[PDB]
Amino acid sequence: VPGMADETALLDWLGTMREKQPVWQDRYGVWHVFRHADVQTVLRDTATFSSDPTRVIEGASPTPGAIHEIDPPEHRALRKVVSSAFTPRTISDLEPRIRDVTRSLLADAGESFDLVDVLAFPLPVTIVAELLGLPPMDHEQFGDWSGALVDIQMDDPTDPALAERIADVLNPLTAYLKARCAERRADPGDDLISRLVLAEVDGRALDDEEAANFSTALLLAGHITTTVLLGNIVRTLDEHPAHWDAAAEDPGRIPAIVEEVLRYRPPFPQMQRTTTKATEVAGVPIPADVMVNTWVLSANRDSDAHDDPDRFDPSRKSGGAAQLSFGHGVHFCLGAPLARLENRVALEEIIARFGRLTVDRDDERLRHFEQIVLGTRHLPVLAGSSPRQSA
Ligand SMILES: CC[C@H]1OC(=O)[C@H](C)[C@@H](O[C@H]2C[C@@](C)(OC)[C@@H](O)[C@H](C)O2)[C@H](C)[C@@H](O[C@@H]2O[C@H](C)C[C@H](N(C)C)[C@H]2O)[C@](C)(O)C[C@@H](C)C(=O)[C@H](C)[C@@H](O)[C@H]1C
Numbered sequence: 042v043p044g045m046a047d048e049t050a051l052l053d054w055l056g057t058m059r060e061k062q063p064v065w066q067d068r069y070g071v072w073h074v075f076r077h078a079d080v081q082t083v084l085r086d087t088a089t090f091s092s093d094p095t096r097v098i099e100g101a102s103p104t105p106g107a108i109h110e111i112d113p114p115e116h117r118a119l120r121k122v123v124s125s126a127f128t129p130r131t132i133s134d135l136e137p138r139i140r141d142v143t144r145s146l147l148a149d150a151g152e153s154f155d156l157v158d159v160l161a162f163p164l165p166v167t168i169v170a171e172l173l174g175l176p177p178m179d180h181e182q183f184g185d186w187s188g189a190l191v192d193i194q195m196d197d198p199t200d201p202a203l204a205e206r207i208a209d210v211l212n213p214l215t216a217y218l219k220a221r222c223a224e225r226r227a228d229p230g231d232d233l234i235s236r237l238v239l240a241e242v243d244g245r246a247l248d249d250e251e252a253a254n255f256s257t258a259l260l261l262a263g264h265i266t267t268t269v270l271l272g273n274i275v276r277t278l279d280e281h282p283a284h285w286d287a288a289a290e291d292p293g294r295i296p297a298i299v300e301e302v303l304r305y306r307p308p309f310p311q312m313q314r315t316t317t318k319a320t321e322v323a324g325v326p327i328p329a330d331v332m333v334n335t336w337v338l339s340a341n342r343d344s345d346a347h348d349d350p351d352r353f354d355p356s357r358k359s360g361g362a363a364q365l366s367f368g369h370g371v372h373f374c375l376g377a378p379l380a381r382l383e384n385r386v387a388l389e390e391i392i393a394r395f396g397r398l399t400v401d402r403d404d405e406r407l408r409h410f411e412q413i414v415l416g417t418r419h420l421p422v423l424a425g426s427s428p429r430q431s432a
């Protein structure tokens with residue numbers, strides 16, 4: 042399998058798999074699914090395709106409060122704890138603050154800067170920290186913890202030792218959040234941690250383990266992908282720069298750009314399930330108790346789903362609930378309205394200040410993530426025209 046960092050090679054490979062081997066078993070006994078229709082089938086059928094990886098990891102037991110790894114009927118009660126925090130009306134109230142953070146961060150940039158260090162990292166981490174009621178002094182901790190997680194040594198995703206390694210890398214974060222949970226129990230505010238520690242799920246409060254693990258999932262979910270998307274947006278516009286001008290003339294076009302970048306370059310290009318029973322996808326027999334890898338990236342480029350799938354085209358009618366890059370079915374991204382707002386406001390503010398940004402391809406800081414996510418660790422950019430220029 043080509044690594045994430047060589048996008049062209051990876052896309053080439055996925056394309057031949059869609060044609061020649063749409064359901065593929067790898068050397069670890071992991072089963073890969075490449076076509077859009079088949080990815081939807083898998084994601085919709087939660088009884089057959091569990092979100093709990095521990096089923097196939099010997100020695101590992103389910104992680105209490107890990108919403109992303111919990112199946113119906115328990116899933117719905119846990120999601121109901123936080124879903125009201127994430128409604129479009131409630132999220133829309135965050136626009137002024139998102140814009141204030143973005144504008145201030147960009148105002149001090151200069152005309153040559155790393156988009157990630159300046160804005161794509163600090164914006165989403167501030168917004169999710171503020172959602173969870175955590176302090177600014179803790180942002181650097183979160184970036185260190187997400188970075189280590191993203192670069193964890195990893196090959197066979199069913200290895201018991203990988204599960205232990207993840208646990209160890211996230212131990213400091215979960216411990217920190219456990220302390221913050223105990224703190225909010227005593228002195229609640231109206232942040233997300235307060236809501237989760239005071240909630241009653243199926244007749245009782247979440248225990249300390251559950252609440253910390255749920256907090257951990259919310260924190261990680263809330264920044265890594267948003268950071269990656271913003272980078273992917275600027276990098277994709279740089280490859281199709283006629284769109285900078287069009288968005289400057291009509292900023293109403295920015296949400297369509299955001300949707301099309303999501304399709305074209307999903308931050309999270311693959312997700313795993315486990316089979317609860319013997320099943321078949323596209324007539325290919327898959328046994329019980331194995332791990333399944335759904336390639337969102339391959340689904341998004343499938344010509345049966347999207348005409349001329351390798352063309353970047355904001356005029357595509359796709360988006361909303363049909364945005365596969367936010368998942369599909371019961372686990373569909375709780376943060377979607379928020380991700381969409383942060384990225385809309387970021388691009389508006391970039392265009393307002395600079396008109397356009399050019400990616401500096403000769404700057405050595407430009408490096409792709411090698412695994413797990415689809416994007417760049419840093420994106421050195423050059424300003425088109427900035428308020429700093431003078432006679
Ligand atoms: C809450 C929803 C979000 O969920 C999370 O953020 C979870 C808390 C992470 O779970 C962690 C921690 C733990 C203890 O869970 C209880 C563990 O049992 C699982 C397996 O790993 C998440 C799944 C991570 O992904 C996984 O990493 C692993 C290191 C490798 C996995 N694969 C490639 C094999 C990969 O699939 C990661 C990095 O955070 C993905 C991020 C960046 C992402 O793009 C998606 C969109 C993410 O935001 C949502 C999915």
Ligand code: HEM
Binds near residue numbers: 259309312368
């Ligand atoms: C552009 C950025 C984002 C992308 C691409 C993205 C993507 C995804 C995807 C693909 C899933 C489903 C994973 C699966 O089915 O296993 C998911 C779930 C989730 N996301 Fe997002 N996300 C983004 C931003 C956010 C933000 C800002 C938040 C706010 C905290 C958030 C919170 C969550 C939560 C809590 C879940 C779990 C939902 C559940 O399991 O019921 N995400 N996300």
